[PDB]
Amino acid sequence: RVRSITLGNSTITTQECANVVVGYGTWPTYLQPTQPDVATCRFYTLESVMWQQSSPGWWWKFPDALSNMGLFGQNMQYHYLGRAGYTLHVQCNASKFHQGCLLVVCVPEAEMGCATIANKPDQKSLSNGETANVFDSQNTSGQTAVQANVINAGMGIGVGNLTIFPHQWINLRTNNSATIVMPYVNSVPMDNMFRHNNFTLMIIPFAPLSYSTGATTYVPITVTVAPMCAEYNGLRLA
Amino acid sequence: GLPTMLTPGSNQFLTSDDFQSPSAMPQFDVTPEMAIPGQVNNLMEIAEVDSVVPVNNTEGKVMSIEAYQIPVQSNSTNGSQVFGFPLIPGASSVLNRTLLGEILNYYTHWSGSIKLTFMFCGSAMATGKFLLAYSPPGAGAPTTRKEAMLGTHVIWDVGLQSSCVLCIPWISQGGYITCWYQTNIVVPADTQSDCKILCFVSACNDFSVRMLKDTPFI
Amino acid sequence: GLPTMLTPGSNQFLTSDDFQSPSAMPQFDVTPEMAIPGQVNNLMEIAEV
Amino acid sequence: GLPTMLTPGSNQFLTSDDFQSPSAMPQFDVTPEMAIPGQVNNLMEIAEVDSVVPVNNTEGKVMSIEAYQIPVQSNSTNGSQVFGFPLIPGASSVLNRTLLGEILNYYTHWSGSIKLTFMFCGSAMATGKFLLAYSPPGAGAPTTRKEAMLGTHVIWDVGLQSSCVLCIPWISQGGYITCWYQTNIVVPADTQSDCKILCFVSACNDFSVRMLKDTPFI
Amino acid sequence: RSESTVENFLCRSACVYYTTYKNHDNFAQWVINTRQVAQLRRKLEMFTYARFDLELTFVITSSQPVLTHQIMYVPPGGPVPTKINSYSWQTSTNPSVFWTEGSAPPRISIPFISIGNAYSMFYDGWARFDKQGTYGINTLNNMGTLYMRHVNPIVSTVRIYFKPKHVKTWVPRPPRLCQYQKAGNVNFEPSGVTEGRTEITAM
Amino acid sequence: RSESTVENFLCRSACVYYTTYKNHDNFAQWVINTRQVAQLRRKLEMFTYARFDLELTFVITSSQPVLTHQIMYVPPGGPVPTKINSYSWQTSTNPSVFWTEGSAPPRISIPFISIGNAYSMFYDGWARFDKQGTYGINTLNNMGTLYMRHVNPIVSTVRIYFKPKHVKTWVPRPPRLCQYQKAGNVNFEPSGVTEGRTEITAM
């Protein structure tokens, strides 16, 4: 019924009945000498976020989200060129007296618009590393701010069409988790992990959280990330 | 040289023609392909993906995520209508901006069947029934629960099934979908808010389109 | 290119000619035929009534 | 004659096209080939030939043969740097006029590995060690001998090997080469002058170029 | 489903650029760009990556003996005219066509020319992370530039017709909801998902 | 390595000559020469010997009913015009093309025509040892001459486009460091090997 998964020196627990979404039907694989690194294939658990009846949604940019994360974060600095796939585990802690529904979606090349049309968004507004950015329910206003109104997913599209990207729904009535496997996707086989975010993870409520009186007023959402088949440019003589 | 005649149609540019042309850079060795996940060969591959339908697109809801959230009042009048809409993917405001709706707006004519999925997002311990009824093209729409019940329908008991799926036999370039409160929603506890229903739409079977046109959304 | 000569009759439109011409809509998939009763192949089929 | 149509692109001159054309003198019998030594089929055959690198191209040295002569001070401070440079064949002033550097300046994009040979030209009885270190792209450059020693390197004992060869795994359209005085140069006698090092560069492996352009040197 | 294929959806001619120039700074230019026309841009942006060859046809007219025009293509990284008599007009690595009025319009084909394995429609990154103004610029999408001049007082008008060929695409995206604001970015005015209705029920 | 072959490096069109003439000594001429354009010359001079055929395309325009132009090629050793009406314009061994405005540009092909087995780029010798002014002249490199006239007040302009074909080369040489001074020699101003730097060390 319950499965224990160990990678490196870290262990997490998932359910055996949980479904797995493999984006684009493709599993991550290995690919001017290139050096693989398996020392980083462990689970990195991000600080959880709290889901309130009024939460508009959250997002993370991945190569950046793990930039401070130990050895993975170090390989990004010692090597200049590289690639990796990821497994993303998203779980909610809720009782049978809670209701609500989330869309958990991974979006490739999620270029985002600016609150001011004449400008481009700043680096921090686009990503705060391991700290989640928050979608707005209203229109965003600022000079370098990301236009975060959730209705357009910050991209100028309708939010209900994000289902075109690898995703899973979490309906607290039936499931409290999602697993997404994201293959490396780019126009080039390897890139500079500090100048480009391969994908963005977005968690957007479509059915507001609510609960019976006396129940806990919020639901924790945890995101755990496990890199796969990471590869970097070699650092030695030929 | 070889005797020839020029015919009508010579020395003119048809914007829709297909002729060979010289390469500006014939000596350039073009970068090889690599596999990229997600190759798309046909737009129907997109039309077949479920997207969320903005059923509650009323004034004041259109600008929010709430457009997608059909409210369910747990203590509503028995037999009242929960929701409903004209079933037209290329015209109705409910369906014409969905992934299916967008693709079909590039074609003058199209036909096929569509799939509608209704998902209940109440608490785990919530139970009750809904009547999902379909009115064939030209039949108008039911005015009462009984009228809806005497046509084609499914009774959706949310206590057994969190979702229910309909496939409309006919969708073309109309019919109606309605949902009625057969029962109220019974819960074990007094909650802060109401329950929501999300609706999804996609192409159901082999769907066909015929002539390409400019989208009406620019 | 290949040496050619244009002959008399070049660049003129004969209303009774028969040459190929480019299609304005080559990407359009044309609606298939169905049998329709009463196909006429020749006008003598009418003259004989 | 045969019915034809002229298409777009007819009666125009593309400077990059490839069509047959009539010979002005078709009756002339062209002089036969004879073997001539040195036939060149590809420019990479030139890029692969070692040439001397003007490492000491400082003001006042550029106009002399001295630009190629890296000085070695036999009594220099231990652990000091002898020489070093940015490893960029298509931009660095050290490498962009070498046989490799010149060929690559005719292309917009290129990549491959390069070979660097360092030759010591001191007396037969001179001995001592040098540290040749390589700093991968983006790693900056070592500031001390110890820092260089902890990266990728070779210890070159001139008493055993008059020359040392490095092959850089990556050279593209950066990294650094540095050389440190691990030891002084020990000699049996008091000489009039210092010792020199010559540096040579060539393509190491299959090297690739993609699009031809005007050279920037006219 | 023939009209739904990627090739039939995208392999269609469009007028992408209109310009005028005189025979007395008197030259025209266009950077090849797939974001100039809203209908072309919206169809291409339904994908994240693409490869295609480009067919370019030039409709050239003029008004006040035989006029000859030169159309030059400068590949990414090639020399660029700043003046009508710049040396760059004669570079052998910048292909050009010499055409005279009265014949069929000029047509040239430019192959896929990126050094990446696909052109990208979107880029969640910076050309340089040190400059925030470079967000969204992927230098791998440089398709080259066209320059146009008379060979030797008249006014010429040029219409450039663009047609993608042998088109392959990857990673489909939602169609844009918002109207386009600028060609150099994805900025938008927040917009509602659809048109409204008066009530949630049928009739 | 396709773009690195000798044929792809050298078999490219270049404008090698620009000239004007009037229809009222009123004729143009060009001695075929591969040292007129610095970029063409520098690439060919990376070799010592070469064989190639020549493709010549003529872009001709004019300004103030149907104008006809005559382009004549005089092979090495053939009769040469001194006057617009010289008898040499009618020699049967001097091929010519008659072209009118409005058609595609004239194009002719001249085969390798030296009596040696290759053209030489360099010549460490004298055409005649009795005359020191002949140093560097290899008479085996005579490729012939072009003469241009109107057939019968206007001004014509001619651009000659040159393209080597089926190019074979031998004995590679270092690229020139110095700028070219004259087409008839290899004279140079002594020049440094590269651009300077401030110190021999990295950073």
PDB file of N, CA, C and O in Angstrom, chain B residues 24-29, chain F residues 2-3 7-8 11-12:
ATOM      1  N   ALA B  24      19.442  30.399 -51.561  1.00  0.00           N
ATOM      2  CA  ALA B  24      20.325  31.539 -51.412  1.00  0.00           C
ATOM      3  C   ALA B  24      21.690  31.102 -50.894  1.00  0.00           C
ATOM      4  O   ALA B  24      22.717  31.640 -51.303  1.00  0.00           O
ATOM      5  N   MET B  25      21.716  30.080 -50.035  1.00  0.00           N
ATOM      6  CA  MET B  25      22.961  29.590 -49.473  1.00  0.00           C
ATOM      7  C   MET B  25      23.144  28.082 -49.627  1.00  0.00           C
ATOM      8  O   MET B  25      23.141  27.366 -48.630  1.00  0.00           O
ATOM      9  N   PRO B  26      23.390  27.569 -50.840  1.00  0.00           N
ATOM     10  CA  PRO B  26      23.496  26.161 -51.164  1.00  0.00           C
ATOM     11  C   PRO B  26      24.723  25.476 -50.582  1.00  0.00           C
ATOM     12  O   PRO B  26      24.792  24.255 -50.532  1.00  0.00           O
ATOM     13  N   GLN B  27      25.708  26.264 -50.173  1.00  0.00           N
ATOM     14  CA  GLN B  27      26.955  25.732 -49.656  1.00  0.00           C
ATOM     15  C   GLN B  27      26.948  25.590 -48.147  1.00  0.00           C
ATOM     16  O   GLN B  27      27.942  25.168 -47.572  1.00  0.00           O
ATOM     17  N   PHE B  28      25.850  25.968 -47.500  1.00  0.00           N
ATOM     18  CA  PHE B  28      25.746  25.885 -46.048  1.00  0.00           C
ATOM     19  C   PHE B  28      25.258  24.521 -45.576  1.00  0.00           C
ATOM     20  O   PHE B  28      24.242  24.006 -46.041  1.00  0.00           O
ATOM     21  N   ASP B  29      25.991  23.929 -44.638  1.00  0.00           N
ATOM     22  CA  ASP B  29      25.649  22.640 -44.055  1.00  0.00           C
ATOM     23  C   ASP B  29      24.740  22.879 -42.851  1.00  0.00           C
ATOM     24  O   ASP B  29      25.178  23.435 -41.838  1.00  0.00           O
TER      25      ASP B  29
ATOM     26  N   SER F   2      32.461  20.476 -44.683  1.00  0.00           N
ATOM     27  CA  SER F   2      32.068  20.804 -46.068  1.00  0.00           C
ATOM     28  C   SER F   2      32.428  22.241 -46.445  1.00  0.00           C
ATOM     29  O   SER F   2      32.968  22.508 -47.513  1.00  0.00           O
ATOM     30  N   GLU F   3      32.253  23.176 -45.513  1.00  0.00           N
ATOM     31  CA  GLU F   3      32.533  24.604 -45.826  1.00  0.00           C
ATOM     32  C   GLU F   3      34.045  24.859 -45.882  1.00  0.00           C
ATOM     33  O   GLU F   3      34.427  25.962 -46.315  1.00  0.00           O
ATOM     34  N   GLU F   7      36.790  23.985 -52.814  1.00  0.00           N
ATOM     35  CA  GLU F   7      35.748  24.427 -53.714  1.00  0.00           C
ATOM     36  C   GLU F   7      34.765  25.317 -52.972  1.00  0.00           C
ATOM     37  O   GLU F   7      34.419  26.381 -53.453  1.00  0.00           O
ATOM     38  N   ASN F   8      34.378  24.991 -51.744  1.00  0.00           N
ATOM     39  CA  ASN F   8      33.435  25.887 -51.079  1.00  0.00           C
ATOM     40  C   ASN F   8      34.072  27.200 -50.638  1.00  0.00           C
ATOM     41  O   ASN F   8      33.418  28.235 -50.586  1.00  0.00           O
ATOM     42  N   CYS F  11      34.846  28.841 -54.614  1.00  0.00           N
ATOM     43  CA  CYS F  11      33.850  28.912 -55.684  1.00  0.00           C
ATOM     44  C   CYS F  11      32.642  29.745 -55.305  1.00  0.00           C
ATOM     45  O   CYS F  11      31.532  29.239 -55.102  1.00  0.00           O
ATOM     46  N   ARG F  12      32.899  31.052 -55.175  1.00  0.00           N
ATOM     47  CA  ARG F  12      31.842  32.012 -54.782  1.00  0.00           C
ATOM     48  C   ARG F  12      31.977  33.272 -55.636  1.00  0.00           C
ATOM     49  O   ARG F  12      33.120  33.690 -55.879  1.00  0.00           O
TER      50      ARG F  12
END
